[PDB]
Design a protein around this nucleic acid. Structure first.
Ligand code: SFG
Length: 457
RNA sequence: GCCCUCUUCAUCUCCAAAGAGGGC
């Protein structure tokens, strides 16, 4: 609608096309209908999801208790403006907050600010512009003036640049907390008083009760279905959104092991675990590809966990909003070998009759369905299983999988439904039945696979 | 000032990158 397609290098944009126009997909659909769904996908990755999704930490407060407190917070932020807060009927701990946008009649100001590409995404998701996110502002920008915020999506603007002619995209207007001289540090930089997409700010709303998580990511731990008193492993876990979710589903009864290769990233897990009141979590900085111990705290012996979650590192191109990804084709393909190494460690560490859930935050066939076919061939002890709840679409063709196997996977296609232009007259002219499905389809690009280990090794 | 590479950290919701070297 409002934003152009995701700016991809000519090499990577065709690398995705080659996978989305494979012989398996263009035979089921049409050759003209296969490219239409691919170019529609490229147009949707630039836009934010039409819903804000929050996960209630049920170990410290109720869904009924946090929803009421969120209504109190939403009226303060929106100044009487009442946007509903739905509750997902399939995910008991997730609340849905519809996005108001895109607004297209916003008058642009002469005072400007450029922010980082990732900071620009958070603005489109309801965040304000804090101090370390501004990359450039107008020369002598007065503290307290209404300012036009733009996202440096190519990430090419140097810090403190007086001007910037490169590709920038309008994010809305707001009044600034600080001056340009004071910027070029923490605190509030630019309070978004008129964003293109309207959604609540969740910076420090209810740190012990909430966790802002995408719907397909909160669905992951539900699909994993941990049980109280089980030994669960989160191989790639930081910052621990799913790890804390798994601990909450077990009522903190059991053992949840969390790993990640970066020291500070692991510290975030420990803070989030303590902040949300989970004591069953134990986080370690460790290479998951080396987490298997043998004859001669990680590493662990094989067949040691009841369930294992591999939210593997990926190309991350199933992210929304994503208006520019300047990666190489080699950097996008950089994740396939590392995924297969982490997968091999999980299969060995999983107990017999254990459950393994594999998930990515990208859209590529080589990282989602091709890995499932590779796993079920290299690991005869594994067997694909149906998922509960089933929220996303079927698996994508091109990996030579069954129709019964594709029906068992959950791939979230942002191309599934058209982008809505939600103003406040639209919700008052809509039913709760339609918005629940829109939240299940207008999601980020995501993939979920679930296996079970038949025999031992 | 404009344009390029390269090294890592990074967007999987909210304090959001900073180095190296080239061309005009
Ligand atoms: N060899 C490794 N061992 C452990 N963790 C890794 C390894 N390589 C990458 N990672 C982590 O894997 C994560 C990739 C993410 N997709 C997982 C994030 C996490 N599931 C979340 O809820 O946000 C990153 O945080 C990486 O730091």
């Amino acid at each position: 609608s409002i934003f152009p397609k995701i700016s991809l290098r000519p090499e990577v944009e065709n690398y995705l096309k080659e996978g989305f126009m494979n012989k398996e997909i263009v035979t089921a659909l049409g050759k003209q209908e296969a490219e239409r769904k691919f170019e529609t996908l490229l147009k949707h990755l630039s836009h934010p999801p039409s819903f804000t999704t929050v996960r209630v930490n049920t170990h410290l407060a109720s869904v009924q208790h946090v929803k009421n407190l969120l209504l109190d917070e939403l009226q303060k932020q929106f100044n009487g403006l009442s946007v509903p807060i739905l509750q997902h009927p399939d995910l008991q701990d997730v609340l849905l907050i519809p996005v108001i946008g895109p607004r297209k009649n916003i008058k642009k100001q002469q005072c400007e600010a450029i922010v980082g590409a990732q900071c620009g995404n958070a603005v489109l998701r309801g965040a304000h512009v804090y101090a370390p996110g501004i990359v450039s502002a107008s020369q002598f920008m007065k503290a307290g003036d209404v300012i036009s915020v733009y996202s440096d999506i190519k990430g090419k603007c140097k810090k403190g640049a007086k001007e910037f002619d490169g590709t920038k995209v309008f994010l809305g207007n707001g009044i600034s907390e600080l001056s340009r001289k004071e910027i070029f540090l923490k605190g509030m930089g630019i309070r978004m008083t008129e964003p293109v997409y309207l959604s609540p700010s969740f910076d420090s709303v209810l740190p012990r009760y909430l966790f802002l998580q995408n719907l397909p990511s909160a669905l992951v731990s539900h699909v994993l279905n941990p049980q109280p008193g089980e030994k669960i492993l989160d191989l790639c876990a930081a910052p621990g959104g799913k790890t804390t979710h798994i601990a909450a589903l077990m009522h903190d009864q059991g053992e949840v092991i969390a790993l990640d290769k970066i020291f500070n990233k692991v510290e975030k897990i420990k803070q989030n675990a303590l902040l949300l009141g989970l004591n069953s979590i134990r986080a370690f900085c460790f290479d998951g590809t080396k987490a298997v111990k043998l004859d001669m705290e990680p590493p662990f012996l094989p067949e040691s966990f009841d369930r294992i979650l591999l939210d593997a590192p990926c190309s991350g191109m199933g992210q929304r909003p994503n208006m520019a990804c300047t990666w190489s084709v080699k950097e996008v393909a950089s994740y396939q070998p590392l995924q297969r190494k982490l997968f091999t460690a999980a299969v060995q560490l999983l107990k017999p009759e254990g459950v393994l859930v594999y998930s990515t935050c990208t859209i590529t066939l080589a990282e989602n369905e091709e890995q499932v076919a590779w796993a079920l061939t290299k690991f005869p002890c594994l067997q694909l299983q149906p998922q509960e709840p089933q929220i996303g679409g079927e698996g994508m063709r091109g990996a030579g999988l069954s129709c019964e196997q594709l029906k068992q996977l959950q791939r979230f296609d942002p191309s599934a439904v058209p982008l809505p232009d939600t103003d406040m007259d639209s919700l008052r002219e809509a039913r709760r039945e339609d918005m629940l499905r829109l939240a299940n389809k207008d999601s980020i690009g995501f993939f979920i696979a679930k296996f079970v280990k038949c025999k031992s090794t």
